[PDB]
Structure 1
Amino acid sequence: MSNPDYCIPNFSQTVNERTIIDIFTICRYRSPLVVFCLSHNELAKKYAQDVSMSSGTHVHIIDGSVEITVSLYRTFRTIATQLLGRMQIVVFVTVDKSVVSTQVMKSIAWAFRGSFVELRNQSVDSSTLVSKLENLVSFAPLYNVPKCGPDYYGPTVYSELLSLATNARTHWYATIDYSMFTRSVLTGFVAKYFNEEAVPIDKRIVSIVGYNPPYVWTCLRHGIRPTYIEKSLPNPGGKGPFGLILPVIYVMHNPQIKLLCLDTFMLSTSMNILYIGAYPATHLLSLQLNGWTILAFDPKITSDWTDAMAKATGAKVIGVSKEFDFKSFSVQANQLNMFQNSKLSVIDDTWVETDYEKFQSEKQAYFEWLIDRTSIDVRLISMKWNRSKDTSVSHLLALLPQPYGASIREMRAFFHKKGASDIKILAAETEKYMDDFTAMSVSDQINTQKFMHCMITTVGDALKMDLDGGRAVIASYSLSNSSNSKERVLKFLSDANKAKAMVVFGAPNTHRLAYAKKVGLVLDSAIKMSKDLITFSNPTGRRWRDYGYSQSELYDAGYVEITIDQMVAYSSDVYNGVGYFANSTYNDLFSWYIPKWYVHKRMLMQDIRLSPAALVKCFTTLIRNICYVPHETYYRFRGILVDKYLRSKNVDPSQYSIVGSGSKTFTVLSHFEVPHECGPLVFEASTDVNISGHLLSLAIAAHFVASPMILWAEQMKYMAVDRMLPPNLDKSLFFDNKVTPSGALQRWHSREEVLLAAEICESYAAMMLNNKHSPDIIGTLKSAINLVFKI
């Protein structure tokens, strides 16, 4: 009949601008999954029952009654459709590690934005296992294990949700936590790239464009070293060649952030470290330090300590249970023999209760000797400083406050070959200084870490840097010029891709921001834009401007969008960063991109880590539930859309018969062709055409969150024929795709079936979203897909 208002499926009454807002809102909950591995199936079943009956959590048990790749396929195909349902989902995995390994299950979990718990080692009465199981029921529908990462150090404290003393509330800073998660994942991705490209460990250095403090920690957590690139040097305003002897004067609650601050910076300066007063050095256990050599001096050191430290960090650890001999000015003393003709830095955390000032006289005289050696490239020495008397020092680059010592009096000195050749430190300056430092707030003390970070900063124009050697760079806002910036950034990226460099690029997505503004989600108050020029502002009222970019602009410059989900899942085997709890609308406005050469080299075979599985079904299923679209009816609508499209190209209806089912979109009756800038699309008599359904649903999802569509399109281009699985990868990572008897990934679609889907994409979006879609989002996707399939 006439009005669609009294017909189903119904888009006209169910999808208005407020439905679109609601889909945006629901996307903040799009990470419901917990993957929990344990070796006791009766225990799994008990907690599965407890959490589903008490909170409605959906529960699955992969117990080995079914072959593992089939059980994964069944379980995660179901889950993929449900990720926007706003209900928790838990998969218990109780098969052996030899059936599905820790690393494979963690990859799958993170590919579905889930938290991951591995406890299969544990006995049935293990207090930790029972604790984590009971936590499922206490916290559901939330969980206190982070998603997509083992650790979290933000303000959220799940135990506060259970305390009457806090009114059973805790902090929740989604954007800040997600931004930190993102910095972590980008670092992890570069770590994975180094590993995949077999870069020598001493060349695992990444350039961060723009000073970004968290990267020091994230890089050392991943065993790579950071260096910042700044266009200009703000004046430290102190004495010494560099102004770091007394210069003028995100959330991360790490337990011993004090010792982490110095040590992660010092581990940047050199792969070889002399550490005096090392015991216990428990904060080092969290880092990845393959390729580092740590010579540790302390009377408390045991054989047990050394072995634990090398096991946990991977560094070469020579632990000697002695006091250091600061009286012997010989390179042959203190075992410094191994550091001959090598770069070395020294972390001195020794101190004495009585005669401290004169203890500092013996060490400083040792460090002044050691700092100008010639058989050892001595790079930097860190020493505690508390001088009540006046003393002159040689080769002193930086006399610095402690950013995490919180109103204490002790200071830190840094010896360097190019520090001041002579300088007398008086005690009234330092007392009046540390008085100023004691006065400043907690936040202000921490931020003096900038002064330590100057020493691992480079001035220069990032757009002019040398990109040879597969150089790794992380770049977003600061990657820009003062002049002609957008054009210069895209040329730089295009050049970087041509050079086979690894410049990782992020930017606000123009058409997603414009869409979120148009439907009324983002206000002019918070973010404005004219064309691709965007003005941001926080409640503080500080404004900054930056350019939005689109997928087709980047592809034209040789760059392919990848999601944060894909980066962390791809990097799962080396990842040692933080996870997250909530998704953030603000973060979802940004897209991240990697150069085309690396996608072609390493990502054309779509295992689950590089797949769109966690986006390709959940928006479609949400809309079908809201709009009353039966499963088979959905495929009928696809057929009707293709019928209308072919008629608009004056294809005569006798050359094809519409089927509109899940297996056949239409059947070709007689030979015809459709003009297309990537074609013509050719259709042969007596064949079935089945268009690419993933293209259609990814085009919807690209309205709301960062899109895997370009990476998918390159994979789809590769999958015109069967492709043998890579021998170096666990076959289980391909569970979600069809595999032939020969062990090959089975072909997906012809180029016709893909480009036909691209051609009807706009009308599909208009149908599913009741003409409240974005033609611009569709158009940039369509243009990029046509470049992928360029003729």
Structure 2
Amino acid sequence: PDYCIPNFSQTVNERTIIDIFTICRYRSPLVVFCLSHNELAKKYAQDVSMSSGTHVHIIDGSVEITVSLYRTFRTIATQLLGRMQIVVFVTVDKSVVSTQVMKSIAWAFRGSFVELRNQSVDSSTLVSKLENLVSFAPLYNVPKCGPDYYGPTVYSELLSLATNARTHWYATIDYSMFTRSVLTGFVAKYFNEEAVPIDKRIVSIVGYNPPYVWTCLRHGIRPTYIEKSLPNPGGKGPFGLILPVIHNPQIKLLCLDTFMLSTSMNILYIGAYPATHLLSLQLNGWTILAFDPKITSDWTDAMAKATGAKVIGVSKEFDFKSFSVQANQLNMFQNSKLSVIDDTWVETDYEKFQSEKQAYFEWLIDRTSIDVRLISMKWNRSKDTSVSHLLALLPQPYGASIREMRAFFHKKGASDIKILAAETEKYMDDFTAMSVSDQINTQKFMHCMITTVGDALKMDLDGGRAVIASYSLSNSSNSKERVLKFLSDANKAKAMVVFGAPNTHRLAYAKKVGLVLDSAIKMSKDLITFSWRDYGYSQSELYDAGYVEITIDQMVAYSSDVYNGVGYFANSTYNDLFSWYIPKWYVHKRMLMQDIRLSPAALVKCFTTLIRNICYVPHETYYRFRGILVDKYLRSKNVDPSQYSIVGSGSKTFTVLSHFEVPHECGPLVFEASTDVNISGHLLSLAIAAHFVASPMILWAEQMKYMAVDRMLPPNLDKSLFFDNKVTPSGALQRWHSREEVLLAAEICESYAAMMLNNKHSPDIIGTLKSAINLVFKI
């Protein structure tokens, strides 16, 4: 035993398990890099491989694209826990594999994606991104699963002695920001797929969570928050927002502008030039009337092209003394909602300028042909003044010791109020004397204006409503019985409530083996204390409530063609303790056909391969072990050994000699004489994967149940998205497995995990997965 291979006994103990958790932080090694020059690709493949040992592939068209993708990514699926970078160069034309398809493939394997085909061989951008492969390996400065990144990590700093060749690295914070981005992108994908009208692209965020304003505007979605908590800001005015108690480029401007854009689809942007930060936003459905004397027709046409909003650029000064909804082209907004962003400034007579603007806005806010929702104005007043319709006067959260505030006019604002320039000087002087992280938190004063107070469990779920209930509904103030009822009702209403919660049994597994010390995180039954209390949730109870787990990887791959969020660089053990869930109705409507975006390809081989390498398990021996596990299961069911013959190969688990049946919750497992049984091996490795990271067992199981028979490919999907599965001559995705082959795998799953993890598995993880698989396959 000690002196036998395969050896799980000496190789897998609690220290090995901890080491697998550790390796899981490095589980995203892939870069996919597309370019049109094969000799360049061959040079840098040689250079990175020879210096760093990066594993390199070139898809160059010597082999048909479907076959090339299949062999390349079957190989790569087994290596994703090897802690070595992997690069796939794609040098075929976009008409051979589109940008969107290759991006889908890259993100489904958790990779960075670089599209530079049809860049000239002279492109400094192409040469630079290639040299960066050799410079940074085994790291790379293009984020995994998204083009952009706005965290503190600065890759250029790793190449320079100025910071001693080191940069910041906040793995947990960056992956959480990535997670919010993806959840938003998934809602954007849902809106596209369900043909939601542009003016209904609104999501409710359960619990205040500031980054969702930016992520929503990055995808053309308007956020709104629901908070149980009464805000009580402690200022004056009807809402207490007049002086309340106290790393994107141009984040200062993004902070206010994405907030204001959240308040109306029609915007009057006074003094808008150049608003470069807007160009990264998706503003389909918005109308922006921009006034600035520096407006050119080219700025107008670039803003409209970048954002997709209908932009009217007025190259004149806006007239603050013409009190007419027919002046300043305001008539375009009659019978509609309007919000106004005033960023105007002048060196000559700045104080008088504002008194003019103030009087104009006090007039404008109260019009009746336009529903003016919110006006924001630079506020830097020397002389005292009395203000009308003032709802808020707030500091800038990214203002950082600066004179100027931001005044907010509203129809529900303070009718009149005396704003003493001695207190606005004091208030700003205190505010100048605070930390960056304190003052940034004052953005909650802005965001309460787009916050509804109420109990999200009581919200109206009508109309296919989109809701992101990230961590919030799992807080122990919401009882599990009420949340499961809510979610069940949400699925029945065919709403889109996206739900996240700590994963009970994975959190418990991580405690039990000594990863988390039982200090930084602690639990008792399903109640969990983080360092606040949430309830953990598991897949069986949620599947009963009509919810199916999907991983974050699957969500961003599925949404790849609308995604406009951030990527990430490292995985994070903390984030991996959570699971995310979507309603069953949407899975069955749109996700039963498993193209690579919804595949668990990047999970089903990498853990098994790592364990076989550690434990000296030969390829064919693995399949022998599987047949032996089946043998012991059938024996334990008093099946007569005479009726079957174990084969134990990749293509045949066993052969049925004579007819027999095994009693099973879902109805007996029927084995007909003289048939070959090939059990569903991916169920077994997904059960191992579920010990360490979110593992999409039930999404795969629903897909697997659907693939009891052949299914025609969907007509509006590039067929290369199906490269990883057999497609019949007729164009049907070929069937996968019978119910017996899947439920048999579920029946031996406990003994498999015990074998592969030296009885140091979690029987609780297995049982909740087994139970939910039986639910998928119920009579």
Common topology (TM > 0.5): yes
Mapped to 2, the partners of 1:180 and 1:333 lie a distance apart of 43
Deviations along 1:309-344, one digit per CA (max 9) or x if unpaired, are: 111101011111111111211111111121110111
Structure 1: which 5+ runs fail to align?
538-543
Shift of residue 425, structure 1, vs aligned partner: 1.3
Query: Given that residues 112 and 614 in structure 1 are in contact (C-alpha distance below 8 angstroms), is that contact kept between their aligned partners in structure 2?
Result: yes
2: distance between equivalents of 1:482 and 1:155? Answer: 33
Distance in 2 separating the partners of 1:774 and 1:548: 16
CA contact (8 A) 2:475 2:535 kept: no
| 8 A Cα contact 1:59 1:90, kept in partner | yes
1:404 aligned residue: 398
Tell me the alpha carbon deviations over residues 722-752 of structure 1, each in whole angstroms, 9 at most, x when there is no partner.
0011111111111111100111100000001
Equivalent residue, structure 1, for 2:472 = 478
Q: Distance in 1 between matches of 2:245 and 2:769?
A: 50
Q: Can you list the C-alpha shifts for 1:441-476, whole angstroms capped at 9, x where unaligned?
A: 222221111111110001001110000111111113
SS in 1 for 2:317: coil
State the SS of the aligned residue for 1:270.
coil
Deviation at 1:482, TM superposition (A): 6.9
Question: How far has the Cα of 1:636 moved from its partner?
Answer: 0.9
Q: Is the 8 A contact 1:463 1:480 kept in 2?
A: no
Following superposition, the deviation at residue 164 of structure 1 comes to 1.5
The answer to whether the aligner puts 1:745 opposite 2:733 as a matched pair is yes
SS across alignment from 1:740: coil
Residues in 2 aligned to 1:491 and 1:390: alpha-carbon distance in whole angstroms = 55
CA offset digits 1:132-187 (Å, max 9, x no partner): 10000000000011000111111111111111121211111111111111111101
CA deviations 1:185-217 (Å, max 9, x no partner) are 101111111111111111111111111011111
The separation in 2 between residues aligned to 1:170 and 1:609, in whole angstroms, is: 33
Q: Distance in 2 between matches of 1:402 and 1:759?
A: 59
* 1:765 CA drift (Å): 0.7
**Alignment partners' CA distance in 2, 1:70 and 1:746:** 16
Does the CA contact (< 8 Å) of 2:231 and 2:448 recur in 1? no
Q: Is the 8 A contact 1:345 1:380 kept in 2?
A: yes
Which residue is 1:262 aligned to? Answer: 256
| TM-superposed deviation, 1:439 | 1.1
> Does the CA contact (< 8 Å) of 2:471 and 2:499 recur in 1?
no
DSSP-derived class of the 2:474 partner: coil
Distance (whole Å) between structure 2 residues aligned to residue 400 and residue 768 of structure 1: 59
State whether residues 32 and 90 of structure 2, in contact with CA within 8 Å, keep that contact through their aligned partners in structure 1.
yes
**Distance in 1, Cα, partners of 2:520 & 2:234:** 36
CA distance in 1, matches of 2:477, 2:361: 46
1:469 aligns with 2:457: no
Q: Deviations over 1:234-255 (max 9, x none)?
A: 3111111111111111xxx111
The separation in 2 between residues aligned to 1:613 and 1:632, in whole angstroms, is: 21
C-alpha deviation, 1:46, in angstroms:
0.2
User: Relative to 1, partners in 2 of residues 1:276 and 1:468: Cα closer, same or farther, differing over 3 Å?
Assistant: same
Cα displacement (A) at 1:679: 1.8
C-alpha distance in 1 between matches for 2:762 and 2:353: 70
Q: Using the alignment, how far apart are the partners of 2:419 and 2:734 within structure 1?
A: 73
Could you tell me how far apart the structure 2 residues matched to 1:62 and 1:531 are?
50
Provide the rounded CA distance (Å) in 1 between the counterparts of 2:578 and 2:384. Answer: 54
> 1:78 Cα deviation (Å)?
0.4
In the alignment, is residue 458 of structure 1 matched against residue 452 of structure 2?
yes
> Matches of 1:606 and 1:330 in 2, distance apart?
58
Residues 1:483 and 1:626: Cα distance change in structure 2 (over 3 Å):
closer
Please say if residues 276 and 347 of structure 1, whose CA atoms lie closer than 8 Å, have aligned partners that are also in contact: yes
Distance 1:9 1:232 in 2: 57
Instruction: Classify the secondary structure of the residue corresponding to 1:226.
Output: strand
Structure 1 residue 499: Cα displacement: 0.6
**Shift of the alpha carbon at 1:525?**
1.5
What CA distance in whole angstroms lies between the structure 1 residues aligned with 2:583 and 2:763? 26
CA contact (8 A) 2:5 2:616 kept: yes
Segment drifting more, 157-166 vs 291-300: 157-166
Selected match of 1:271 from 239, 262, 265: 265
Farther-moved stretch of structure 1 (483-492 vs 520-529)? 483-492
Task: Tell me how far apart the structure 2 counterparts of residues 384 and 166 of structure 1 sit (CA, whole Å).
Answer: 37
| Alpha-carbon distance in structure 1 between the residues aligned to 2:721 and 2:564 | 20
Superimposed CA distance per residue, residues 111-137 of structure 1 (whole angstroms, 9 cap, x where no aligned partner): 000001111121002111101100000
Give the conservation status (yes or no) of the 8 Å contact 2:608–2:685: yes
SS at match of 2:277: helix
Once residues 735 and 533 of structure 2 are traced to their aligned partners in structure 1, the CA distance between those partners, rounded to angstroms, is: 45
Per-residue deviation, 1:423: 1.5
Q: Deviations over 1:751-770 (max 9, x none)?
A: 01000000000001111111
What is the CA distance between 1:225 and its match in structure 2? 0.7
Secondary structure of residue in 1 paired with 2:262:
helix
Q: C-alpha distance in 1, partners of 2:95/2:325?
A: 50
User: How far is the alpha carbon of 1:481 from its aligned partner?
Assistant: 7.3
What is the CA-CA distance between 1:483 and the residue it aligns to? 5.8
Local SS of the residue matching 1:767: helix
Q: CA deviation at 1:484?
A: 6.2
Structure 2 residues not aligned, in runs of 5+: none
Q: Is the 8 A contact 2:28 2:571 kept in 1?
A: yes
List per-residue Cα deviations over 1:89-122 (Å, max 9, x = no partner): 0000111111111111111100000001111121
Could you give the per-residue CA deviations for residues 577-598 of structure 1, whole angstroms, max 9, x where no partner exists?
A: 1111000111111100001000
Equivalent-residue separation in structure 2 for 1:446 and 1:121 (angstroms): 42
1:555 aligns with 2:543: yes
Q: Does 1:316 align with 2:304?
A: no
2:418 and 2:476 map into 1 onto residues whose CA distance is 42
Deviation of 1:478 (Å): 2.4
> Is the 1:393–1:424 contact (alpha carbons within 8 Å) kept by the matching residues of 2?
yes
CA 1:484 to 1:317, structure 2 compared with 1: closer, same or farther past 3 Å?
A: closer
C-alpha contact 2:366 2:411 (8 A) present in aligned 1: yes
Once residues 617 and 425 of structure 2 are traced to their aligned partners in structure 1, the CA distance between those partners, rounded to angstroms, is 74
After superposition, the C-alpha distances for 1:241-274 in whole angstroms (9 at most, x for unaligned) are 111111111xxx1110010010000000000001
1:232 CA displacement: 2.1
Matched residues in 1 for 2:575 and 2:475: separation? 23
CA apart distance, 1:8: 1.3
**CA–CA distance in structure 1, aligned partners of residues 218 and 178 of structure 2:** 13
CA contact (8 A) 1:341 1:377 kept: yes
Same amino acid, percent of matched pairs: 100
Q: Please report the TM-score for the alignment, with normalisation by the length of structure 1.
A: 0.98
Contact 1:481–1:488 (CA under 8 A) maintained in structure 2: no
Distance of 2:471 and 2:595 partners within structure 1: 31
Distance 1:482 1:142 in 2: 39
Any conservation in 1 of the 2:476–2:535 contact (CA below 8 Å)?
Answer: no
Separation of aligned partners in 2, 1:235 and 1:343: 27
Q: Secondary structure at the match of 1:269?
A: coil
The Cα shift of 1:5 comes to: 1.7
Q: Hey, what does 1:785 align to over in structure 2? A: 773
Secondary structure of the 1:254 match is coil
Q: Is the Cα–Cα contact under 8 Å of residues 476 and 533 in structure 2 kept in the other structure?
A: no
Structure 1 contact 271–343 (Cα < 8 Å) conserved: yes
Report the secondary structure of 1:516's partner residue.
Answer: helix
2:474–2:535: 8 Å Cα contact kept in structure 1? no
Is the 2:476–2:527 contact (alpha carbons within 8 Å) kept by the matching residues of 1?
Answer: no
Q: What's the offset of the Cα at 1:545?
A: 1.2
Q: Report Cα offsets for 1:562-609 as digits up to 9, x if no partner.
A: 000000100111111111100011111110000100000000000000
The whole-number CA distance in structure 1 between the counterparts of 2:474 and 2:507 is 20
Work out whether residues 253 and 277 of structure 2, in 8 Å CA contact, stay in contact via their aligned partners in 1: yes
CA distance in 2 between partners of 1:477 and 1:152 (Å): 23
Q: Quote the offset at 1:477 in angstroms.
A: 3.2
**Does the CA-based 8 Å contact 1:480-1:488 persist in structure 2?**
no
Q: CA deviation at 1:388?
A: 1.3
2:348 to 354, 364, 371: 354
1:564 and 1:134, CA in 2 relative to 1: closer, same or farther beyond 3 A?
A: same
How far 1:20 sits from its partner (Å)? 0.9
**Whole-angstrom CA distance in 2 between matches of 1:425 and 1:769:** 69
